[PDB]
Design a protein around this ligand. Structure first.
Ligand SMILES: Nc1ncnc2c1ncn2[C@@H]1O[C@H](COP(=O)(O)OP(=O)(O)O)[C@@H](O)[C@H]1O
Ligand SMILES: Nc1ncnc2c1ncn2[C@@H]1O[C@H](COP(=O)(O)O)[C@@H](O)[C@H]1O
Length: 206
């Protein structure tokens, strides 16, 4: 089974992908997490990606397609989390899967209003030692745990990331709807409720 999580930044895609991977055995491919690590390590991908990320722009398609080709697992169920983000990426994914006799099975659109994702992003915190994601209101970090704020979670960069989503990524909704594999998730609900709907749409009995 191959899943794609699609939606605005702050919709809760990473949170749901991590839980599904932990509980249901999926391989979690987060282009965001992989890119952030590349930046921290200063790899050729990282050094090139850094400035796009910092501006809230998408990293160029060529770099991302190569990344996915390199890391796509030979076996296992997969959650693509924040990939594809453009039509060219989606076309490349389809071709990569075809060559392996596979296909995208479900695309989940995390539907949620702007004011919700803006509060979620503004309040997002990360434990730099474990990578664990918190929210100052909805899931506070434990006392005594040092956390950081992502630079791209600043108000002006958030604005850009949302603009980019609406311009470049939202066209994937129709792309996948035409394939008959798009299902809509109410991502505005609490974490547990969203997770139950995720399981429902992918045909899991929970
Ligand atoms: N259903 C939810 N309700 C409230 N807060 C959430 C929910 N899902 C995620 N969060 C919080 O919102 C922020 C964004 O979630 P995240 O999973 O990082 O979203 P994305 O990967 O779509 O950008 C994080 O701080 C996370 O703790
Ligand atoms: N599939 C992708 N294509 C291009 N850029 C990406 C992709 N995934 C993540 N990024 C970059 O990484 C940043 C953080 O990703 P995310 O954590 O998914 O919001 C984005 O704002 C982009 O700069």
């Amino acid at each position: 089974m191959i899943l794609v999580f699609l939606g605005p930044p702050g919709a809760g895609k990473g949170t749901q992908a991590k839980r599904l991977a932990k509980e249901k055995g999926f391989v979690h491919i987060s282009t965001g997490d992989i890119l952030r690590e590349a930046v921290q390590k200063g790899t050729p991908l990282g050094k090139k990606a850094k400035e796009y990320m910092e501006r809230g722009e998408l990293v160029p398609d060529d770099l991302i397609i190569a990344l996915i080709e390199e890391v796509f697992p030979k076996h296992g169920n997969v959650i693509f989390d924040g990939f594809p983000r453009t039509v060219k990426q989606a076309e490349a994914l389809d071709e990569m899967l075809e060559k392996k006799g596979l296909k995208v099975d479900h695309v989940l659109l995390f539907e949620v209003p702007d004011e919700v994702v803006i509060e979620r992003l503004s309040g997002r915190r990360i434990n730099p030692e474990t990578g664990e994601v918190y929210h100052v209101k909805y899931n506070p970090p434990p006392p005594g745990v040092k956390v950081i704020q992502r630079e791209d979670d600043k108000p002006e960069v958030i604005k850009k990331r949302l603009e980019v989503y609406r311009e470049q990524t939202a066209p994937l909704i129709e792309y996948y709807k035409k394939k008959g594999i798009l299902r809509i998730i109410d991502a505005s609900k609490p974490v547990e409720e969203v997770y139950r709907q995720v399981l429902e749409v992918i045909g899991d009995g929970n």
